[PDB]
Amino acid sequence: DLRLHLLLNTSVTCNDGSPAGYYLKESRGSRRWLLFLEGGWYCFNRENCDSRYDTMRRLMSSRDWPRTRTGTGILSSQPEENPYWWNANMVFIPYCSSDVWSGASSKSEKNEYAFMGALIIQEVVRELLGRGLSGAKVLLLAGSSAGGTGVLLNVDRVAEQLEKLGYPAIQVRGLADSGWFLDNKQYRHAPTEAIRRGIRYWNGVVPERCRRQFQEGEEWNCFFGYKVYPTLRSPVFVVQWLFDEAQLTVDNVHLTGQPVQEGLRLYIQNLGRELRHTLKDVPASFAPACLSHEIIIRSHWTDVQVKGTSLPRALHCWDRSLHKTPLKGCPVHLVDSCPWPHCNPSCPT
Ligand SMILES: OCc1ccc(-n2cnc3ccccc32)cc1
Ligand SMILES: OCc1ccc(-n2cnc3ccccc32)cc1
Ligand SMILES: OCc1ccc(-n2cnc3ccccc32)cc1
Ligand SMILES: *[C@@H]1O[C@H](CO)[C@@H](O)[C@H](O)[C@H]1NC(C)=O
16 A cells, blocks of 8 residues: 655645645665656636535545555556556655646635645655655656646656756656647537636646747647657656547547447547657657557556557566667557557457
8 A cells, every 4th residue: 555645845735725745655675766646637717616626625635535545557566467667666646736737826815726736746756855765766757647748747847856956866757648639629619728727727837948939828738748748858658549538528529329420430530640640759659549548557557558569568668768779579669550449459348
Protein backbone atom coordinates (compact mmCIF):
# COMPACT_ATOMS: atom_id res chain seq x y z
CA ASP A 1 0.00 0.00 0.00
CA LEU A 2 0.84 3.67 -0.55
CA ARG A 3 0.37 5.84 2.54
CA LEU A 4 -1.22 9.30 2.64
CA HIS A 5 0.75 12.43 3.53
CA LEU A 6 -1.07 15.75 3.67
CA LEU A 7 1.06 18.70 2.62
CA LEU A 8 2.91 20.42 5.45
CA ASN A 9 2.31 23.74 3.69
CA THR A 10 -1.42 23.91 4.35
CA SER A 11 -1.82 26.98 2.10
CA VAL A 12 -1.51 24.68 -0.95
CA THR A 13 -5.07 23.40 -1.07
CA CYS A 14 -7.75 21.44 -2.85
CA ASN A 15 -10.77 23.30 -4.26
CA ASP A 16 -12.47 23.80 -0.88
CA GLY A 17 -9.39 24.89 1.08
CA SER A 18 -8.57 21.52 2.63
CA PRO A 19 -4.90 20.48 2.32
CA ALA A 20 -3.70 18.69 -0.78
CA GLY A 21 -1.42 15.68 -0.43
CA TYR A 22 0.18 12.58 -1.90
CA TYR A 23 0.37 8.81 -1.34
CA LEU A 24 3.88 7.32 -1.06
CA LYS A 25 5.55 3.90 -0.97
CA GLU A 26 9.33 4.12 -0.58
CA SER A 27 11.82 1.67 -2.11
CA ARG A 28 15.10 2.40 -0.33
CA GLY A 29 17.08 0.34 -2.83
CA SER A 30 16.07 2.46 -5.83
CA ARG A 31 17.02 5.86 -7.27
CA ARG A 32 13.95 5.95 -9.57
CA TRP A 33 10.85 7.97 -8.62
CA LEU A 34 7.50 7.77 -10.38
CA LEU A 35 5.02 10.62 -9.70
CA PHE A 36 1.51 9.94 -11.07
CA LEU A 37 -1.18 12.57 -11.70
CA GLU A 38 -4.82 11.45 -11.40
CA GLY A 39 -7.46 12.62 -13.86
CA GLY A 40 -11.19 13.27 -13.86
CA TRP A 41 -12.44 16.06 -16.16
CA TYR A 42 -12.67 19.58 -14.64
CA CYS A 43 -15.07 22.42 -13.84
CA PHE A 44 -15.10 25.93 -15.28
CA ASN A 45 -17.64 28.19 -13.50
CA ARG A 46 -19.35 28.59 -10.13
CA GLU A 47 -22.45 26.60 -11.05
CA ASN A 48 -20.81 23.51 -12.56
CA CYS A 49 -18.16 23.51 -9.81
CA ASP A 50 -20.97 23.52 -7.22
CA SER A 51 -22.46 20.50 -9.00
CA ARG A 52 -19.10 18.69 -8.90
CA TYR A 53 -18.84 19.43 -5.16
CA ASP A 54 -22.04 17.50 -4.42
CA THR A 55 -21.40 14.29 -6.38
CA MET A 56 -17.62 14.22 -7.06
CA ARG A 57 -16.33 15.68 -3.80
CA ARG A 58 -13.19 13.52 -3.55
CA LEU A 59 -11.99 15.45 -6.63
CA MET A 60 -12.45 18.77 -4.76
CA SER A 61 -11.47 18.00 -1.12
CA SER A 62 -9.22 15.84 1.14
CA ARG A 63 -11.92 15.87 3.55
CA ASP A 64 -12.82 12.18 2.99
CA TRP A 65 -9.58 10.62 1.61
CA PRO A 66 -8.53 7.21 2.98
CA ARG A 67 -5.31 6.54 4.87
CA THR A 68 -3.96 4.20 2.15
CA ARG A 69 -4.33 3.24 -1.51
CA THR A 70 -3.30 0.15 -3.47
CA GLY A 71 -0.78 0.70 -6.25
CA THR A 72 -1.95 -0.83 -9.53
CA GLY A 73 -0.53 -1.10 -13.02
CA ILE A 74 2.57 1.05 -13.41
CA LEU A 75 2.21 1.86 -9.69
CA SER A 76 2.32 -1.82 -8.68
CA SER A 77 5.39 -3.08 -6.85
CA GLN A 78 4.88 -6.57 -8.14
CA PRO A 79 6.98 -7.65 -11.14
CA GLU A 80 4.16 -9.86 -12.48
CA GLU A 81 1.87 -6.81 -12.72
CA ASN A 82 4.55 -4.17 -13.49
CA PRO A 83 7.42 -5.46 -15.66
CA TYR A 84 8.70 -1.90 -16.16
CA TRP A 85 9.37 -0.18 -12.81
CA TRP A 86 8.26 -2.57 -10.03
CA ASN A 87 11.15 -1.56 -7.74
CA ALA A 88 10.67 2.21 -8.01
CA ASN A 89 9.59 4.70 -5.38
CA MET A 90 5.84 5.15 -6.03
CA VAL A 91 3.83 8.37 -5.61
CA PHE A 92 0.12 8.91 -6.41
CA ILE A 93 -0.97 12.57 -6.36
CA PRO A 94 -4.78 12.88 -6.06
CA TYR A 95 -6.52 15.33 -8.41
CA CYS A 96 -8.43 17.76 -6.19
CA SER A 97 -8.06 21.05 -8.11
CA SER A 98 -10.45 20.56 -11.09
CA ASP A 99 -8.15 22.65 -13.32
CA VAL A 100 -6.33 20.07 -15.52
CA TRP A 101 -3.36 20.69 -13.18
CA SER A 102 -2.91 24.26 -14.49
CA GLY A 103 -4.15 26.56 -11.72
CA ALA A 104 -2.33 29.03 -9.48
CA SER A 105 -5.10 30.81 -7.57
CA SER A 106 -6.07 30.66 -3.90
CA LYS A 107 -9.40 30.95 -2.15
CA SER A 108 -10.05 34.60 -1.34
CA GLU A 109 -12.72 37.24 -0.80
CA LYS A 110 -13.21 37.11 -4.59
CA ASN A 111 -12.85 33.34 -5.11
CA GLU A 112 -15.24 30.67 -3.80
CA TYR A 113 -12.79 27.92 -4.82
CA ALA A 114 -9.02 27.50 -5.01
CA PHE A 115 -7.43 26.19 -8.22
CA MET A 116 -3.84 25.26 -7.34
CA GLY A 117 -2.94 22.24 -9.49
CA ALA A 118 0.37 23.63 -10.77
CA LEU A 119 1.38 24.59 -7.22
CA ILE A 120 0.33 21.21 -5.79
CA ILE A 121 2.87 19.53 -8.09
CA GLN A 122 5.56 22.05 -7.02
CA GLU A 123 4.89 21.45 -3.31
CA VAL A 124 4.81 17.64 -3.56
CA VAL A 125 8.22 17.75 -5.25
CA ARG A 126 9.65 20.15 -2.65
CA GLU A 127 8.48 18.02 0.28
CA LEU A 128 9.66 14.74 -1.30
CA LEU A 129 13.22 16.09 -1.60
CA GLY A 130 13.54 15.71 2.18
CA ARG A 131 12.19 12.14 1.99
CA GLY A 132 14.79 10.71 -0.40
CA LEU A 133 14.04 12.39 -3.74
CA SER A 134 17.26 14.40 -3.30
CA GLY A 135 19.18 11.25 -4.24
CA ALA A 136 17.16 10.39 -7.34
CA LYS A 137 18.62 9.63 -10.76
CA VAL A 138 15.31 9.81 -12.68
CA LEU A 139 11.98 11.49 -11.87
CA LEU A 140 9.21 10.25 -14.19
CA LEU A 141 6.14 12.51 -14.08
CA ALA A 142 3.23 10.41 -15.36
CA GLY A 143 -0.54 10.84 -15.54
CA SER A 144 -3.79 9.75 -17.16
CA SER A 145 -6.59 11.75 -18.87
CA ALA A 146 -6.55 15.25 -17.29
CA GLY A 147 -3.38 14.04 -15.60
CA GLY A 148 -1.86 13.21 -18.97
CA THR A 149 -2.50 16.74 -20.22
CA GLY A 150 -1.14 17.86 -16.85
CA VAL A 151 2.15 16.11 -17.61
CA LEU A 152 2.52 18.12 -20.82
CA LEU A 153 1.75 21.36 -18.95
CA ASN A 154 4.06 20.78 -15.97
CA VAL A 155 7.05 18.54 -16.86
CA ASP A 156 9.36 21.42 -17.83
CA ARG A 157 8.30 23.40 -14.74
CA VAL A 158 9.41 20.52 -12.51
CA ALA A 159 12.73 20.37 -14.36
CA GLU A 160 13.21 24.11 -13.87
CA GLN A 161 12.25 23.87 -10.19
CA LEU A 162 14.87 21.20 -9.48
CA GLU A 163 17.55 23.14 -11.38
CA LYS A 164 16.75 26.25 -9.33
CA LEU A 165 16.72 24.31 -6.08
CA GLY A 166 20.22 22.94 -6.67
CA TYR A 167 19.54 19.40 -7.97
CA PRO A 168 20.90 19.37 -11.54
CA ALA A 169 21.62 15.62 -11.63
CA ILE A 170 17.96 14.49 -11.41
CA GLN A 171 16.72 13.64 -14.92
CA VAL A 172 13.09 14.76 -15.32
CA ARG A 173 10.96 12.92 -17.90
CA GLY A 174 7.27 12.73 -18.75
CA LEU A 175 4.73 10.00 -19.52
CA ALA A 176 1.42 11.36 -20.85
CA ASP A 177 -1.42 8.81 -21.00
CA SER A 178 -4.73 9.67 -22.73
CA GLY A 179 -4.11 13.42 -22.75
CA TRP A 180 -3.33 14.00 -26.45
CA PHE A 181 -6.43 15.56 -28.04
CA LEU A 182 -7.35 17.08 -31.41
CA ASP A 183 -9.32 20.32 -31.78
CA ASN A 184 -11.29 18.86 -34.68
CA LYS A 185 -14.82 19.43 -35.96
CA GLN A 186 -17.53 17.65 -34.01
CA TYR A 187 -19.67 14.95 -35.59
CA ARG A 188 -22.82 16.76 -34.40
CA HIS A 189 -23.10 20.13 -32.70
CA ALA A 190 -17.73 25.23 -29.22
CA PRO A 191 -15.85 22.76 -27.01
CA THR A 192 -12.66 24.85 -26.84
CA GLU A 193 -14.66 27.67 -25.20
CA ALA A 194 -14.77 25.66 -21.96
CA ILE A 195 -10.93 25.67 -21.86
CA ARG A 196 -10.94 29.29 -22.63
CA ARG A 197 -13.42 29.86 -19.72
CA GLY A 198 -11.50 27.66 -17.38
CA ILE A 199 -8.09 29.26 -17.81
CA ARG A 200 -9.60 32.63 -16.87
CA TYR A 201 -11.56 31.15 -13.94
CA TRP A 202 -8.49 29.27 -12.62
CA ASN A 203 -5.70 31.74 -13.41
CA GLY A 204 -4.31 28.87 -15.44
CA VAL A 205 -0.66 28.72 -16.46
CA VAL A 206 0.95 27.06 -19.49
CA PRO A 207 4.60 26.40 -20.42
CA GLU A 208 6.47 29.61 -21.23
CA ARG A 209 7.78 28.70 -24.69
CA CYS A 210 4.26 27.71 -25.78
CA ARG A 211 2.79 30.88 -24.24
CA ARG A 212 5.30 32.98 -26.20
CA GLN A 213 4.16 31.40 -29.47
CA PHE A 214 0.41 31.84 -29.00
CA GLN A 215 0.48 35.00 -26.76
CA GLU A 216 -2.25 36.62 -24.60
CA GLY A 217 -5.75 35.22 -24.80
CA GLU A 218 -4.71 32.18 -26.83
CA GLU A 219 -3.24 30.03 -24.04
CA TRP A 220 -5.93 27.39 -24.71
CA ASN A 221 -3.78 26.19 -27.63
CA CYS A 222 -1.19 24.81 -25.19
CA PHE A 223 -3.71 22.29 -23.80
CA PHE A 224 -3.43 20.41 -27.12
CA GLY A 225 -0.52 18.01 -27.19
CA TYR A 226 0.46 18.40 -30.83
CA LYS A 227 0.91 22.15 -30.25
CA VAL A 228 2.64 22.10 -26.85
CA TYR A 229 4.89 19.03 -27.33
CA PRO A 230 7.30 20.73 -29.81
CA THR A 231 8.01 23.45 -27.22
CA LEU A 232 9.08 21.03 -24.45
CA ARG A 233 12.66 20.21 -23.58
CA SER A 234 12.24 17.23 -21.25
CA PRO A 235 11.82 13.79 -22.84
CA VAL A 236 8.14 12.82 -23.09
CA PHE A 237 6.59 9.45 -24.00
CA VAL A 238 3.03 9.72 -25.36
CA VAL A 239 0.36 7.02 -24.92
CA GLN A 240 -2.92 7.57 -26.81
CA TRP A 241 -5.67 5.31 -28.12
CA LEU A 242 -6.40 6.21 -31.74
CA PHE A 243 -10.16 6.22 -30.97
CA ASP A 244 -10.16 7.70 -27.47
CA GLU A 245 -13.51 7.72 -25.67
CA ALA A 246 -13.07 11.19 -24.14
CA GLN A 247 -12.17 12.59 -27.57
CA LEU A 248 -15.27 10.96 -29.07
CA THR A 249 -17.43 12.19 -26.19
CA VAL A 250 -16.60 15.80 -26.82
CA ASP A 251 -17.04 15.14 -30.58
CA ASN A 252 -20.63 13.98 -29.81
CA VAL A 253 -20.10 10.43 -31.02
CA HIS A 254 -21.74 7.50 -29.18
CA LEU A 255 -20.51 4.10 -30.48
CA THR A 256 -23.23 2.04 -28.81
CA GLY A 257 -25.99 1.42 -31.34
CA GLN A 258 -25.24 -1.37 -33.84
CA PRO A 259 -25.51 0.18 -37.39
CA VAL A 260 -22.81 2.71 -38.38
CA GLN A 261 -23.64 4.56 -41.62
CA GLU A 262 -21.29 6.11 -44.20
CA GLY A 263 -20.96 9.58 -42.69
CA LEU A 264 -19.93 8.27 -39.28
CA ARG A 265 -17.63 5.63 -40.79
CA LEU A 266 -15.71 8.33 -42.66
CA TYR A 267 -15.62 10.54 -39.55
CA ILE A 268 -14.14 7.75 -37.41
CA GLN A 269 -11.58 6.76 -40.05
CA ASN A 270 -10.48 10.38 -40.55
CA LEU A 271 -10.04 10.83 -36.79
CA GLY A 272 -7.66 7.88 -36.56
CA ARG A 273 -5.66 9.08 -39.56
CA GLU A 274 -5.37 12.60 -38.13
CA LEU A 275 -4.19 11.27 -34.76
CA ARG A 276 -1.66 9.03 -36.54
CA HIS A 277 -0.37 12.10 -38.39
CA THR A 278 0.16 14.16 -35.22
CA LEU A 279 2.37 11.38 -33.78
CA LYS A 280 4.56 10.86 -36.82
CA ASP A 281 7.41 13.03 -35.46
CA VAL A 282 6.98 11.84 -31.85
CA PRO A 283 9.80 9.28 -31.42
CA ALA A 284 8.56 7.80 -28.10
CA SER A 285 4.89 6.86 -28.46
CA PHE A 286 2.40 3.99 -28.10
CA ALA A 287 -0.87 4.42 -30.03
CA PRO A 288 -3.11 1.37 -30.51
CA ALA A 289 -6.15 1.29 -32.80
CA CYS A 290 -8.71 0.79 -30.04
CA LEU A 291 -11.82 2.47 -28.65
CA SER A 292 -10.98 2.93 -24.95
CA HIS A 293 -9.80 5.45 -22.35
CA GLU A 294 -6.79 5.50 -19.98
CA ILE A 295 -4.19 2.74 -19.90
CA ILE A 296 -1.38 2.89 -17.35
CA ILE A 297 -2.74 2.24 -13.82
CA ARG A 298 -5.04 -0.66 -14.71
CA SER A 299 -3.89 -4.08 -13.57
CA HIS A 300 -3.97 -5.68 -17.05
CA TRP A 301 -2.10 -2.86 -18.78
CA THR A 302 0.51 -5.38 -19.96
CA ASP A 303 -1.88 -7.15 -22.35
CA VAL A 304 -2.06 -4.61 -25.21
CA GLN A 305 0.57 -4.84 -27.97
CA VAL A 306 1.41 -2.82 -31.08
CA LYS A 307 3.37 -4.66 -33.79
CA GLY A 308 4.01 -7.38 -31.19
CA THR A 309 5.44 -5.07 -28.49
CA SER A 310 3.75 -4.28 -25.17
CA LEU A 311 3.73 -0.90 -23.43
CA PRO A 312 5.97 -2.06 -20.53
CA ARG A 313 8.50 -3.23 -23.14
CA ALA A 314 8.29 0.05 -25.06
CA LEU A 315 8.92 1.99 -21.84
CA HIS A 316 11.94 -0.20 -21.05
CA CYS A 317 13.28 0.48 -24.55
CA TRP A 318 12.79 4.20 -23.91
CA ASP A 319 14.90 3.90 -20.74
CA ARG A 320 17.67 2.23 -22.77
CA SER A 321 17.49 4.93 -25.45
CA LEU A 322 18.13 7.59 -22.79
CA HIS A 323 21.34 6.02 -21.48
CA LYS A 324 20.43 8.68 -31.42
CA THR A 325 20.69 5.25 -33.03
CA PRO A 326 17.69 2.90 -32.62
CA LEU A 327 17.99 -0.36 -30.71
CA LYS A 328 17.90 -3.85 -32.20
CA GLY A 329 14.57 -5.48 -31.39
CA CYS A 330 13.62 -2.89 -28.75
CA PRO A 331 11.43 -0.23 -30.38
CA VAL A 332 10.10 3.03 -28.95
CA HIS A 333 7.79 4.41 -31.71
CA LEU A 334 4.71 2.17 -31.93
CA VAL A 335 1.65 3.51 -33.80
CA ASP A 336 -1.00 1.29 -35.39
CA SER A 337 -1.76 1.78 -39.08
CA CYS A 338 -5.02 -0.19 -39.34
CA PRO A 339 -8.03 2.12 -39.71
CA TRP A 340 -10.91 0.85 -37.46
CA PRO A 341 -11.50 0.21 -33.74
CA HIS A 342 -10.20 -3.07 -32.53
CA CYS A 343 -8.47 -3.96 -35.79
CA ASN A 344 -5.65 -4.70 -33.36
CA PRO A 345 -6.61 -8.05 -31.74
CA SER A 346 -5.07 -7.08 -28.37
CA CYS A 347 -7.47 -4.19 -27.64
CA PRO A 348 -9.23 -4.27 -24.24
CA THR A 349 -12.51 -6.14 -24.39
O1 LIG B 1 -19.97 10.90 -20.18
C1 LIG B 1 -20.77 12.05 -20.38
C2 LIG B 1 -19.95 13.31 -20.49
C3 LIG B 1 -20.29 14.28 -21.41
C4 LIG B 1 -19.54 15.43 -21.53
C5 LIG B 1 -18.45 15.63 -20.70
N1 LIG B 1 -17.69 16.83 -20.84
C6 LIG B 1 -17.41 17.45 -22.03
N2 LIG B 1 -16.69 18.53 -21.89
C7 LIG B 1 -16.48 18.67 -20.52
C8 LIG B 1 -15.80 19.65 -19.81
C9 LIG B 1 -15.76 19.54 -18.43
C10 LIG B 1 -16.38 18.48 -17.77
C11 LIG B 1 -17.05 17.50 -18.46
C12 LIG B 1 -17.09 17.61 -19.85
C13 LIG B 1 -18.10 14.67 -19.77
C14 LIG B 1 -18.85 13.51 -19.67
O1 LIG C 1 -17.58 17.88 -13.32
C1 LIG C 1 -18.17 19.12 -13.67
C2 LIG C 1 -18.86 19.06 -15.00
C3 LIG C 1 -18.88 20.16 -15.84
C4 LIG C 1 -19.50 20.10 -17.08
C5 LIG C 1 -20.13 18.93 -17.47
N1 LIG C 1 -20.79 18.83 -18.73
C6 LIG C 1 -21.89 18.05 -18.98
N2 LIG C 1 -22.31 18.13 -20.21
C7 LIG C 1 -21.43 19.00 -20.85
C8 LIG C 1 -21.40 19.43 -22.18
C9 LIG C 1 -20.40 20.30 -22.55
C10 LIG C 1 -19.45 20.74 -21.64
C11 LIG C 1 -19.47 20.33 -20.32
C12 LIG C 1 -20.48 19.45 -19.94
C13 LIG C 1 -20.13 17.84 -16.63
C14 LIG C 1 -19.49 17.90 -15.41
O1 LIG D 1 -12.61 20.06 -30.96
C1 LIG D 1 -12.46 18.82 -30.28
C2 LIG D 1 -12.08 19.00 -28.84
C3 LIG D 1 -11.41 18.01 -28.15
C4 LIG D 1 -11.07 18.18 -26.81
C5 LIG D 1 -11.41 19.35 -26.17
N1 LIG D 1 -11.10 19.54 -24.78
C6 LIG D 1 -12.02 19.91 -23.83
N2 LIG D 1 -11.51 20.02 -22.64
C7 LIG D 1 -10.15 19.75 -22.79
C8 LIG D 1 -9.13 19.74 -21.85
C9 LIG D 1 -7.85 19.44 -22.27
C10 LIG D 1 -7.59 19.14 -23.61
C11 LIG D 1 -8.59 19.14 -24.55
C12 LIG D 1 -9.88 19.44 -24.13
C13 LIG D 1 -12.10 20.34 -26.84
C14 LIG D 1 -12.42 20.17 -28.18
C1 LIG E 1 3.37 27.73 1.07
O1 LIG E 1 3.10 27.75 -0.29
C2 LIG E 1 2.71 29.04 -0.76
C3 LIG E 1 2.22 28.86 -2.18
O2 LIG E 1 3.26 28.38 -3.02
C4 LIG E 1 3.90 29.98 -0.65
O3 LIG E 1 3.47 31.28 -1.00
C5 LIG E 1 4.46 29.99 0.77
O4 LIG E 1 5.75 30.59 0.75
C6 LIG E 1 4.60 28.59 1.37
N1 LIG E 1 4.81 28.68 2.81
C7 LIG E 1 5.95 28.35 3.42
C8 LIG E 1 5.96 28.52 4.91
O5 LIG E 1 6.92 27.93 2.80
